[PDB]
Ligand binder design. Structure first.
Ligand SMILES: OC[C@@H]1O[C@@H](OC[C@@H]2O[C@@H](OC[C@@H]3O[C@@H](O)[C@H](O)[C@H]3O)[C@H](O)[C@H]2O)[C@H](O)[C@H]1O
Ligand SMILES: [Ca+2]
Length: 296
């Protein structure tokens, strides 16, 4: 049943599949109410072999594990490459580079331990100055294309991407502005299914999830419509999409948890995702019941 975790508040889920298990990473909401602001210090890790029963692994990483960060364990994403696990995170940078930043940690296993892979930020606020806000450099998504080129996607208000080196911890080209995403807010997730690329994102505010399709990782991106309605009792809508055991899953968050779930006290949920024959995605139907076990 959704929400899937009832002893903690979890937000901004990311997932990956590794050796027949799905690993789920989420920020932990620790705000005492829904009237002040997000309080997030650490990210939690969970895993499942059936998408229904989840093992808790505990905190895999903390914002303070980056010596150059102030705190704020915001949206993050993990990807496997060459037997390692790279965890791209959003954190508030210390005063040396004011504003939010993207950092990267690395581990030898999906449950870590993880450590700062650079000793400094990968993206700092001052690298991107086409907007005056100091929270535009948040919410990273990393994708490795069929030719072996990795890309870092990110942004709030301004969607952007850049090539990553094969070492996964350095940029390898210019930062590009992404076009084709109407009402872009945040939460980019990129995935590929058959011969189409999909870029889904939080759209407008209060946030829906919209998406665009492209014939290449570079687009051009063609908006296809609404993937998720505004989520129950939350103005932020943050998604991850994965394939597991021949089904597709839409992992997201709501404010439907207890006690007093809400905008700063969120809860991860999961529902199934379905494709149309033309490659478009049916709009999600968010449900109390959630998904049935799907064991291999
Ligand atoms: O006002 C509408 C949209 O809100 C912002 O995006 C959503 C929020 O962005 C992040 O942080 C919220 C802001 O960042 C903090 O530094 C700033 O003080 C908060 O206002 C969260 O992910 C969302 O709540 C866009 O700026 C705007 O279009
Ligand atoms: Ca910036």
């Amino acid at each position: 049943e959704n929400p899937i975790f009832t002893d903690v508040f979890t937000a901004a889920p990311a997932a990956l599949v590794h050796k027949g298990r799905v690993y789920l990473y989420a920020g932990r909401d620790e705000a005492p109410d829904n009237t002040t602001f997000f309080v997030m210090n650490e990210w939690l890790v969970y895993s499942s072999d059936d998408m229904a029963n989840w093992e808790a692994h505990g905190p895999g990483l903390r914002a303070k594990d980056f010596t150059w960060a102030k705190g704020d364990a915001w949206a993050s994403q993990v990807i496997e490459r060459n037997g390692k696990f790279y965890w791209y995170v959003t954190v508030r940078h210390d005063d040396t580079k004011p504003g939010f930043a993207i950092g990267v940690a690395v581990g030898d296993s999906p449950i870590g331990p993880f450590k700062d892979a650079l000793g400094k930020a990968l993206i700092t606020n001052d690298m991107t100055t086409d907007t005056p806000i100091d929270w535009d450099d948040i919410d990273p998504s990393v994708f490795i294309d069929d030719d072996g080129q990795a890309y870092l996607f990110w942004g709030n208000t301004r969607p952007r991407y850049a090539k990553l080196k094969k070492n996964m911890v350095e940029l390898d080209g210019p930062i590009r502005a992404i076009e084709g995403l109407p009402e872009f807010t945040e939460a980019i997730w990129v995935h590929k299914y058959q011969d189409n690329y999909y870029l889904s994102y939080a759209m407008g505010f209060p946030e829906k999830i919209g998406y665009a399709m492209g014939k290449s990782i570079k687009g051009p991106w063609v908006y296809k419509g609404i993937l998720n309605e505004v989520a129950g009792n939350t103005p932020t809508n943050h998604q991850a999409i994965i394939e597991f055991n021949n089904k597709h899953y839409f992992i997201y968050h709501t404010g439907a948890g207890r006690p007093d779930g809400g905008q700063y006290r969120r809860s991860v949920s999961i529902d199934e995702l379905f494709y149309n024959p033309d490659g478009t995605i049916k709009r999600i139907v968010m449900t109390t019941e959630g998904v049935a076990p799907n064991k291999s």
